[PDB]
Amino acid sequence: VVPLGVIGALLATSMRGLSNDVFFQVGLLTTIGLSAKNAILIVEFAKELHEQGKGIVEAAIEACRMRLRPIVMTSLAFILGVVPLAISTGAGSGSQHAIGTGVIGGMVTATVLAIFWVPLFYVAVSTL
Amino acid sequence: MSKFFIDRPIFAWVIALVIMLAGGLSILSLPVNQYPAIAPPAIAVQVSYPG
Amino acid sequence: FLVMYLFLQNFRATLIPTIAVPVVLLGTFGVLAAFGFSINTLTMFGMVLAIGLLVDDAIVVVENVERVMAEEGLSPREAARKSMGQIQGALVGIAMVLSAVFLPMAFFGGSTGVIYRQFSITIVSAMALSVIVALILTPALCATMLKPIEKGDHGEHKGGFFGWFNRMFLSTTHGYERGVASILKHRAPYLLIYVVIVAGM
Amino acid sequence: GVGYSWTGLSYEERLSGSQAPALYALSLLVVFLCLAALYESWSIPFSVML
Per-residue burial over C26-43, b if 16 or more Cβ lie within 10 Å, else e, is bbbbbbbbeeebebbbbb
Class of residue A74 by CB neighbours under 10 A (exposed 0-12, middle 13-18, buried 19+): buried
Distances in Å between the Cα of C49 and the Cα atoms of A2, A84, B14, C53, C61 are: 18, 10, 28, 8, 22
C39 pairs with which residues across the strands?
A: B32
Chain D CB contacts of B18 under 8 Å are 30, 33-34
Among positive and negative, which fits the CA dihedral C30, C35, C36, C38? Answer: negative
- Which of B8, B11, B18 comes nearest D30 by C-beta? B18
- Which of B2, B35, B39 comes nearest C135 by C-beta? B2
DSSP C151: -
B14 interfaces chain C, CB cutoff of 8 Å: no
Confirm if C20 and C141 have CB atoms less than 8 A apart. Answer: no
DSSP B27: G
Of the residues A73, A75, A93, A122, the best mutation for testing chain C's interface (the one with the most C CB atoms within 10 Å of its CB) is A73
Confirm if C26 and B20 have CB atoms less than 8 A apart. Answer: yes
Helices (H), chain C: 2-8, 11-18, 22-35, 41-54, 56-71, 76-84, 88-99, 111-116, 121-136, 138-143, 165-186, 189-200
| Resolution in angstrom units | 3.2
- The method recorded for this entry reads cryo-EM
C-alpha–C-alpha distance, residues B3 and C197, integer Å: 47
Rounded to the nearest 10 degrees, what angle do helices A56-87 and C41-54 cross at? 150
Maximum Cα interatomic distance, chain D, rounded to a whole number of Å: 64
Q: Cα–chain-centroid distance for residue C24?
A: 14
| Among D38, D40, D41, D31, residue whose Cα is nearest residue D50 | D31
Confirm if C128 and C99 have CB atoms less than 8 A apart. Answer: yes
CA dihedral A87, A93, A98, A100 (to 10 degrees): -30
Rounded to the nearest 10 degrees, what angle do helices C76-84 and C56-71 cross at? 120
Q: Do B25 and D34 touch (CB under 8 A)?
A: no
Class of residue C3 by CB neighbours under 10 A (exposed 0-12, middle 13-18, buried 19+): middle
Nearest residue in chain C measured CA to CA from A43: C90
Maximum Cα interatomic distance, chain B, rounded to a whole number of Å: 86
Q: How many CA atoms lie within 13 A of B33 on its CB side?
A: 9
Q: Do C48 and A26 touch (CB under 8 A)?
A: no
- Which of B6, B20, B30 comes nearest C23 by C-beta? B20
- Which of B8, B9, B14 comes nearest D34 by C-beta? B14
C-alpha–C-alpha distance, residues A78 and A31, integer Å: 11
Chain B CB contacts of C117 under 8 Å are 36
- C52 C-beta neighbours (distance < 10 Å), count: 22
C-alpha–C-alpha distance, residues C48 and C56, integer Å: 14
DSSP D10: G
C-alpha–C-alpha distance, residues C87 and C144, integer Å: 19
C-alpha–C-alpha distance, residues C193 and C78, integer Å: 47
